[PDB]
PDB file of C-alpha atoms and ligand atoms in Angstrom:
ATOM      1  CA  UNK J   4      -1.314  51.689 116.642  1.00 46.32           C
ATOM      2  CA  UNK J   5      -1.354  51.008 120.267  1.00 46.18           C
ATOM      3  CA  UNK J   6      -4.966  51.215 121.083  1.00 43.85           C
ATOM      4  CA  UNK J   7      -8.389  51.140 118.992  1.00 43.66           C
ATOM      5  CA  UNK J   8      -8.692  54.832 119.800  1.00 42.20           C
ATOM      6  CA  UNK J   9      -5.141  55.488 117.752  1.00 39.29           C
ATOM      7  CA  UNK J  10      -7.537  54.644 114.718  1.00 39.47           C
ATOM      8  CA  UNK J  11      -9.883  56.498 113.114  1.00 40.70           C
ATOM      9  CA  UNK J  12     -13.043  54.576 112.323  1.00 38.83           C
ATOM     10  CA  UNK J  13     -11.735  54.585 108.209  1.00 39.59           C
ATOM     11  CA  UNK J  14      -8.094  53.541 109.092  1.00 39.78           C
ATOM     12  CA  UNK J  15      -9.811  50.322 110.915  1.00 37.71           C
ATOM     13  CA  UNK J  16     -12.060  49.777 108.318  1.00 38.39           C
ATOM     14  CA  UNK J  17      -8.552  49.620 105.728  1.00 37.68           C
ATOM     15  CA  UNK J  18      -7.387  46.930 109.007  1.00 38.62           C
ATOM     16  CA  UNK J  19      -9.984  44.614 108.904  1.00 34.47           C
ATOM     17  CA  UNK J  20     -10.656  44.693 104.614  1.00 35.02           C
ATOM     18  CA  UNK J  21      -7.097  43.562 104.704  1.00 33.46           C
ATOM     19  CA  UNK J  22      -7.764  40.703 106.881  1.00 29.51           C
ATOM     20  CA  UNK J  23     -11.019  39.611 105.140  1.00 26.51           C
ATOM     21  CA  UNK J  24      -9.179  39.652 102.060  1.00 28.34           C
ATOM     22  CA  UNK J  25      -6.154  37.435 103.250  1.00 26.18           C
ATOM     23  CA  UNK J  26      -4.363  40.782 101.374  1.00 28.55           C
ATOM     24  CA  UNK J  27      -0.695  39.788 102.908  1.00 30.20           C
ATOM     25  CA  UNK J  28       2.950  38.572 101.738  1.00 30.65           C
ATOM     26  CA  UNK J  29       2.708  35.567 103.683  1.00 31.88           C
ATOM     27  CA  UNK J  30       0.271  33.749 106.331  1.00 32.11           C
ATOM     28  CA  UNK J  31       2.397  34.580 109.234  1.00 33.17           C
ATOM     29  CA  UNK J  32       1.595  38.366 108.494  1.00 32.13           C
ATOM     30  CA  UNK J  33      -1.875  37.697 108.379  1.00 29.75           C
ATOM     31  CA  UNK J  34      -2.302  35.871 111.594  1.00 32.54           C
ATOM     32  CA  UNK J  35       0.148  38.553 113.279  1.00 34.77           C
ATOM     33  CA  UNK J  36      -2.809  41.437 112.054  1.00 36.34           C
ATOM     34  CA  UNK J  37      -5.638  38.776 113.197  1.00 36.91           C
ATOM     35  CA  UNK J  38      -4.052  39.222 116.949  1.00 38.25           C
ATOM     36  CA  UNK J  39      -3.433  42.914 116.436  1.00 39.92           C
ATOM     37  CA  UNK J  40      -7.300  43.032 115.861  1.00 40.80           C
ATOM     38  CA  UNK J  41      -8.326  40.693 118.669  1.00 42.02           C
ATOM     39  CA  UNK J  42      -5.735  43.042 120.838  1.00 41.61           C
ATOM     40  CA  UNK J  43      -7.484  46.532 119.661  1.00 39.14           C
ATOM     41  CA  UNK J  44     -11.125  45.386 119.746  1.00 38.25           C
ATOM     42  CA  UNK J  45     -10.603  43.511 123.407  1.00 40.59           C
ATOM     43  CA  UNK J  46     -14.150  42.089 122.174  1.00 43.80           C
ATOM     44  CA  UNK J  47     -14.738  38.598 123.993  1.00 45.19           C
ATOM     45  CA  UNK J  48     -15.273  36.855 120.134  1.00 48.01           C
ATOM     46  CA  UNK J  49     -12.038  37.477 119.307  1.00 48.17           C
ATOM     47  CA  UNK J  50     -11.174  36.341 115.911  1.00 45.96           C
ATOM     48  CA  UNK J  51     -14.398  34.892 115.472  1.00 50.01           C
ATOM     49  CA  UNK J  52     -16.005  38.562 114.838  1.00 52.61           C
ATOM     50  CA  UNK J  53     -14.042  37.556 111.216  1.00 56.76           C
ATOM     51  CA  UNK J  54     -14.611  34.070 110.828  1.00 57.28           C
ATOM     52  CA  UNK J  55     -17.069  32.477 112.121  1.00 58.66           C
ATOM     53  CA  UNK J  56     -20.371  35.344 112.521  1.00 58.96           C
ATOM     54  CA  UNK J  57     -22.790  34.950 115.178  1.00 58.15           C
ATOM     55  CA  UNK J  58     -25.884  34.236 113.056  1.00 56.76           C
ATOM     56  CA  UNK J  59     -27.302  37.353 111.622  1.00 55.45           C
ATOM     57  CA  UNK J  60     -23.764  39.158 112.118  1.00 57.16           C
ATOM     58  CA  UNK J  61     -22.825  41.230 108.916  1.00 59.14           C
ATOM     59  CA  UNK J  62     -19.260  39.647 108.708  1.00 59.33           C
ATOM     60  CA  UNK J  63     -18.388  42.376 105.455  1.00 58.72           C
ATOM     61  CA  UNK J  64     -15.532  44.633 106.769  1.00 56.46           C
ATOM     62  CA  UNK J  65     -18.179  47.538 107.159  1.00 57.08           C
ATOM     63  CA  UNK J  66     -20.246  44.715 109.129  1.00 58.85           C
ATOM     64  CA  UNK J  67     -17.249  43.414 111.766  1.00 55.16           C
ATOM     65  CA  UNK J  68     -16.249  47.541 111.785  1.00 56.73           C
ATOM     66  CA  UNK J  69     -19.846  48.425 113.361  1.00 56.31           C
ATOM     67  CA  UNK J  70     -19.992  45.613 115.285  1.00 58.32           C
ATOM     68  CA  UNK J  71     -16.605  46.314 117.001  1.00 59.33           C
ATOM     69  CA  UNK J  72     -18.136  50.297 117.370  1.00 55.09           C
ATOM     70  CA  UNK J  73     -21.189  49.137 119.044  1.00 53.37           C
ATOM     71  CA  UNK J  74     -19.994  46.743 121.660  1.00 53.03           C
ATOM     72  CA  UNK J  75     -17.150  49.108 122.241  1.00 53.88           C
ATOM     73  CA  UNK J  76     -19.965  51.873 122.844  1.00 50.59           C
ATOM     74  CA  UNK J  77     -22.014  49.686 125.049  1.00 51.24           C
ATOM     75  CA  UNK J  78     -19.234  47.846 126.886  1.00 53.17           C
ATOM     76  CA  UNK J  79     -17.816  51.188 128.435  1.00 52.08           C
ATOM     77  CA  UNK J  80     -14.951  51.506 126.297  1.00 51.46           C
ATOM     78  CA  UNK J  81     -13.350  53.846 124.194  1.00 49.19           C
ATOM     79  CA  UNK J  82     -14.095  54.838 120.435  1.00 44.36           C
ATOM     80  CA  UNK J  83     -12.106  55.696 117.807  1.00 43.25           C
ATOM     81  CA  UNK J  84     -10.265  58.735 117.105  1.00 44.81           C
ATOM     82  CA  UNK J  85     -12.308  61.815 115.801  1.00 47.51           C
TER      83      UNK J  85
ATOM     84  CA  UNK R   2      17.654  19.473 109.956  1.00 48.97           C
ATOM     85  CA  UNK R   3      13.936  18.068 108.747  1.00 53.53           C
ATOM     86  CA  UNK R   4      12.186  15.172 106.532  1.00 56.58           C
ATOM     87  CA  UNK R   5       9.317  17.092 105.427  1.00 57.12           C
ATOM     88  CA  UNK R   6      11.320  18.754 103.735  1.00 54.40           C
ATOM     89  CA  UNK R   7      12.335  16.318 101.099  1.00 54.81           C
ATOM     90  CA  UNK R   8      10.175  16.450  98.049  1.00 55.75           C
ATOM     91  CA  UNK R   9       7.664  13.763  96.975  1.00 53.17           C
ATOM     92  CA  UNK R  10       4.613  12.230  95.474  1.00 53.91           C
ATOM     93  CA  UNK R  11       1.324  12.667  96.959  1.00 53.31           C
ATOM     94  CA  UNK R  12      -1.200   9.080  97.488  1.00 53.43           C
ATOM     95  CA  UNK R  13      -4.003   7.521  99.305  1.00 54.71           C
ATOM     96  CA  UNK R  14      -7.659   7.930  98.876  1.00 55.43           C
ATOM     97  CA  UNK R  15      -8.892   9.740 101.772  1.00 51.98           C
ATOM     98  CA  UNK R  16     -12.334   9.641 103.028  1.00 49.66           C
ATOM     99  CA  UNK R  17     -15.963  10.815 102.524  1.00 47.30           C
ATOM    100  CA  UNK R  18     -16.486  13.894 104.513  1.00 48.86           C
ATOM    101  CA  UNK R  19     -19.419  16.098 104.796  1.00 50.29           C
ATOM    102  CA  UNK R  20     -20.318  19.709 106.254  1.00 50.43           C
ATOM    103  CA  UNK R  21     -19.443  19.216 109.439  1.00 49.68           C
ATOM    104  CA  UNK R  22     -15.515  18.103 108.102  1.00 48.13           C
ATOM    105  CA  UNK R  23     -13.676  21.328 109.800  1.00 45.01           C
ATOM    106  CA  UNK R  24     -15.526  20.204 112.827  1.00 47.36           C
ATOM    107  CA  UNK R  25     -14.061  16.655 113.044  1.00 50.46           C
ATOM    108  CA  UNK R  26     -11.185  18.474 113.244  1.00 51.85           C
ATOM    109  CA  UNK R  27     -11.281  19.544 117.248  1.00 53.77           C
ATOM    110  CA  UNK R  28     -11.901  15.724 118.042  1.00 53.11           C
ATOM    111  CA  UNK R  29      -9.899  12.497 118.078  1.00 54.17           C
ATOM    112  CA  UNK R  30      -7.074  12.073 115.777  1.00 55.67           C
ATOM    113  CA  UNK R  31      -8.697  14.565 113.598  1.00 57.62           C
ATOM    114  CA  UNK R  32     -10.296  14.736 110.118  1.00 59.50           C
ATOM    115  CA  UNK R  33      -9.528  12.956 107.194  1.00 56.98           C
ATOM    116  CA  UNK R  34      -8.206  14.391 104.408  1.00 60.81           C
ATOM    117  CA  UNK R  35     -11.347  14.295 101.590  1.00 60.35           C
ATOM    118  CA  UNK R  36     -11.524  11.881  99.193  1.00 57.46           C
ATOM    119  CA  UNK R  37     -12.143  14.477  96.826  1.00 55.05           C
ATOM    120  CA  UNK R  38      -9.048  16.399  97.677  1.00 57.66           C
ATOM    121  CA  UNK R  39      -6.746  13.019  97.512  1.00 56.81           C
ATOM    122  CA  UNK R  40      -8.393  12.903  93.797  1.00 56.61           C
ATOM    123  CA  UNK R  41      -6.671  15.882  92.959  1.00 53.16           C
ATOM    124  CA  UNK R  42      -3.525  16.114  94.420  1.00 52.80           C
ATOM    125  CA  UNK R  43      -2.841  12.237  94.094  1.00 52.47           C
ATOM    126  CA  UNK R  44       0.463  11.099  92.096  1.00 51.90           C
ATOM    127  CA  UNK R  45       1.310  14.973  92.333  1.00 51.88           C
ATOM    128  CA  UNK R  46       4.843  15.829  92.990  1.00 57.06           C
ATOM    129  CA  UNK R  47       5.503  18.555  96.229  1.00 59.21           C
ATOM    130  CA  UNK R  48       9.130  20.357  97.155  1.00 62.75           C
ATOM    131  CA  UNK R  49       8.272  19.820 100.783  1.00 63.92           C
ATOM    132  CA  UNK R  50       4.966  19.177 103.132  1.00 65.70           C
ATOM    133  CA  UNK R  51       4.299  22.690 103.214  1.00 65.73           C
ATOM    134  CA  UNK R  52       4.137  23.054  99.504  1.00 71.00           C
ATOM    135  CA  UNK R  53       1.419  20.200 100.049  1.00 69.98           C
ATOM    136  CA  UNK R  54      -0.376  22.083 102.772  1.00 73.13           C
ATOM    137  CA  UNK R  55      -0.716  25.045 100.477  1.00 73.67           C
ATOM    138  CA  UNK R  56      -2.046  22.647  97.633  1.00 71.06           C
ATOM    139  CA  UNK R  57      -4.637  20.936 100.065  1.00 70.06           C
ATOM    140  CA  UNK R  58      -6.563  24.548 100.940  1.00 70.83           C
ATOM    141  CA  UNK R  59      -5.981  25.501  97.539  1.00 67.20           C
ATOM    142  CA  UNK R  60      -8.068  22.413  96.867  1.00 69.17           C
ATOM    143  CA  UNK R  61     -10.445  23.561  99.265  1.00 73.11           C
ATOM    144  CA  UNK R  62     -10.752  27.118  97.789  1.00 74.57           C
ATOM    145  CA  UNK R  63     -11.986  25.236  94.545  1.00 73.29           C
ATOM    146  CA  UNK R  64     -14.246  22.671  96.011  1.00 77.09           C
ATOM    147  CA  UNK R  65     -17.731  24.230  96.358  1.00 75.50           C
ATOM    148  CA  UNK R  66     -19.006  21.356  98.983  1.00 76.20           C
ATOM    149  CA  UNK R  67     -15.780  22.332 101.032  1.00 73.10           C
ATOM    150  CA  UNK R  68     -15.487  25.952 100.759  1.00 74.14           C
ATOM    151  CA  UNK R  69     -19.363  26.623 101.328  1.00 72.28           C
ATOM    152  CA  UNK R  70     -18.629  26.121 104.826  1.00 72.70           C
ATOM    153  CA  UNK R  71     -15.824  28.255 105.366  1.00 75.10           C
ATOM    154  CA  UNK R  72     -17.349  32.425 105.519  1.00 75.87           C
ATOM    155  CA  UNK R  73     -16.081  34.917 103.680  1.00 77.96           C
ATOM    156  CA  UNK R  74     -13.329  36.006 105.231  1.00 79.99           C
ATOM    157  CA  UNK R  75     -11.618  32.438 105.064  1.00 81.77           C
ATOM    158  CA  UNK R  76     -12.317  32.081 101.688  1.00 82.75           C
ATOM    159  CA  UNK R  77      -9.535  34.591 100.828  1.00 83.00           C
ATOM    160  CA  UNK R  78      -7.488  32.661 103.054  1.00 83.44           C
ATOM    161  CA  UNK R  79      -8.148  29.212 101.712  1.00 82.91           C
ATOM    162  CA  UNK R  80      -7.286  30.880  97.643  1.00 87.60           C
ATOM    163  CA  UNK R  81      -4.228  31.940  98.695  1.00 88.54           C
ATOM    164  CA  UNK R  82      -3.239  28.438 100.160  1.00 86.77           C
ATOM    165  CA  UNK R  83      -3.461  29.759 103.596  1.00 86.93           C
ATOM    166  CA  UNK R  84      -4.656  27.160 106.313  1.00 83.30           C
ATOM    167  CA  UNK R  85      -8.107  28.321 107.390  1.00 81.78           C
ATOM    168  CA  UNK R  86      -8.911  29.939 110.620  1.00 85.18           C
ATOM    169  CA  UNK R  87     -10.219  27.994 113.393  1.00 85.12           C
ATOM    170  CA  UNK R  88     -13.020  28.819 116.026  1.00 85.95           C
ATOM    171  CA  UNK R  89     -11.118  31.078 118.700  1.00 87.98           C
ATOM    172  CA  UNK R  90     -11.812  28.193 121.048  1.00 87.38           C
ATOM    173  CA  UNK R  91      -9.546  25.656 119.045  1.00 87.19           C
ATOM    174  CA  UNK R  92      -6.815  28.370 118.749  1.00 88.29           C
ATOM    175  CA  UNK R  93      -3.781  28.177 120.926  1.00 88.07           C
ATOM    176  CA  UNK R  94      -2.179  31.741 121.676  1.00 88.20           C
ATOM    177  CA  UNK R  95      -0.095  32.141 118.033  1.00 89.24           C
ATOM    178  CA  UNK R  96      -1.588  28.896 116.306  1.00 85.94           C
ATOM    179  CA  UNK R  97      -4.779  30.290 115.247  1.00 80.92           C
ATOM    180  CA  UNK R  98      -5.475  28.103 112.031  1.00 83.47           C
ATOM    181  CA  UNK R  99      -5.601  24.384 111.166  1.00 83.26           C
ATOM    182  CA  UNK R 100      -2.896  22.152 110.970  1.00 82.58           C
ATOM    183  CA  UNK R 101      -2.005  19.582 109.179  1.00 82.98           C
ATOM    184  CA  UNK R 102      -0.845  16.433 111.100  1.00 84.89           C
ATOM    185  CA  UNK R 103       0.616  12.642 110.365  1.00 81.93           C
ATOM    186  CA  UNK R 104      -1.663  10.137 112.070  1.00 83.82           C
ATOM    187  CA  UNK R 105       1.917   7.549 112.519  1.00 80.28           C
ATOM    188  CA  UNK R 106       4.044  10.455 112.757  1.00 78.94           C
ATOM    189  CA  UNK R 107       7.250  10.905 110.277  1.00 76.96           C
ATOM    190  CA  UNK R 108       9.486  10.558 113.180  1.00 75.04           C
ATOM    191  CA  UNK R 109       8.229   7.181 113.330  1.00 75.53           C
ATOM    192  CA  UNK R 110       8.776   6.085 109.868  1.00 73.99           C
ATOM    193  CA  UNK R 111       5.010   7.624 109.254  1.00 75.60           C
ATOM    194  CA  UNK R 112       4.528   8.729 105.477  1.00 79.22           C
ATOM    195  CA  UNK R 113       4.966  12.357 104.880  1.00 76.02           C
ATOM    196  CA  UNK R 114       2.736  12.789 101.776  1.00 71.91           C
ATOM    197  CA  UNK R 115       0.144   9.415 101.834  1.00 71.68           C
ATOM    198  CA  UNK R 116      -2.874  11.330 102.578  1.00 72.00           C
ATOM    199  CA  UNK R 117      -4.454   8.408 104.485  1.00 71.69           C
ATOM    200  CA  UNK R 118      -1.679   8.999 106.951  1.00 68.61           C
ATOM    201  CA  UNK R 119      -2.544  12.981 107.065  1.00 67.35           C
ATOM    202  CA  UNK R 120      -5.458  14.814 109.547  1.00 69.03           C
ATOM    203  CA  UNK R 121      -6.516  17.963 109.796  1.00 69.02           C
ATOM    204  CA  UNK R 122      -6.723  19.035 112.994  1.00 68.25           C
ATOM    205  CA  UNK R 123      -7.413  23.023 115.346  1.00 68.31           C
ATOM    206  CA  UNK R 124      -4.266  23.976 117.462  1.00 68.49           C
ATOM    207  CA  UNK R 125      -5.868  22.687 120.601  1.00 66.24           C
ATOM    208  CA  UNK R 126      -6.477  18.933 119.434  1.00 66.23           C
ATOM    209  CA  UNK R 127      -2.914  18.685 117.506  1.00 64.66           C
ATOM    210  CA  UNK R 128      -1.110  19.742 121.011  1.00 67.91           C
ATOM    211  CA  UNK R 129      -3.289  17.704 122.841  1.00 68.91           C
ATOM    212  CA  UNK R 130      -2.426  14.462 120.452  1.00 66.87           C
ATOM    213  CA  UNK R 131       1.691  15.054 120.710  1.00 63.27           C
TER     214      UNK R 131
HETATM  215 ZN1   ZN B   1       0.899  15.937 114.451  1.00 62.60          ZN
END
């Protein structure tokens, strides 16, 4: 898991429900995935795409997943795998 | 090797706080701990301050005029006793979520678990105040 394009669309979607749900041993994992995230999406918003919506953001993990896709897409940068 | 690590009693009252509590946090010496919160976890024995930290946003989980302005997403984090996230502009490179802080600090002879001596405070204001 180097890059956003080492996932497939589902295997990020499995990255970010785990965030949203705080699913982790400890909060030291958690933040550790948070900057994982912010690392793969290279989105400007950072850990605010998770937290703290834009108003009228969908900030469900299907939401934060297209919103990732679609900046990606129109910011010139890669997509996920398949 | 630390003092917040001895166990003790939690006191103090806290103040009224409002939506814009997590806020207050990025300014000043930081935000009180709620007067509601001190209700609950006052005369309440802890292991150590971090055993109190977890208590405080497990507070927050259950307080519907302090969780309804944290999103989804911290909401899980808050009923697991995790410290909320802050704004990405508050966050300093690993210290992404709010910290507690003492307002006289322990190393001072500052009380460890009198909540009128306890803030809540973003990454960027608690570096800025030490
Ligand atoms: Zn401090």
């Amino acid at each position: 898991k180097h890059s956003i394009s080492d996932y497939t669309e589902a295997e990020f979607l499995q990255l970010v429900t785990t965030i949203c749900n705080a699913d982790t041993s400890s909060e030291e994992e958690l933040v550790k995935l948070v900057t994982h995230f912010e690392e793969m999406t290279e989105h400007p918003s950072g850990s605010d795409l998770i937290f703290y919506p834009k108003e009228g953001d969908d900030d469900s993990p299907s939401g934060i997943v297209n919103t990732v896709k679609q900046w990606r897409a129109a910011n010139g940068k890669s997509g996920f795998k398949q | 090797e630390s003092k917040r690590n001895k166990p003790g009693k939690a006191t103090g009252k806290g103040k009224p706080v409002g939506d814009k509590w997590l806020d207050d946090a990025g300014k000043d010496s930081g935000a009180p701990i709620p007067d509601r919160i001190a209700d609950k976890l006052r005369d309440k024995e802890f292991k150590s301050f971090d055993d109190f930290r977890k208590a405080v946003w497990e507070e927050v989980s259950k307080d519907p005029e302090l969780s309804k302005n944290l999103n989804p997403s911290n909401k899980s984090s808050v009923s697991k006793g995790y410290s909320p996230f802050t704004p990405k502009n508050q966050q300093v490179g690993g210290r992404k979520v709010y910290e507690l802080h003492h307002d006289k600090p322990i190393s001072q002879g500052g009380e460890v678990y009198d909540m009128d001596n306890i803030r809540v405070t973003t990454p960027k204001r608690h570096i800025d105040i030490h």
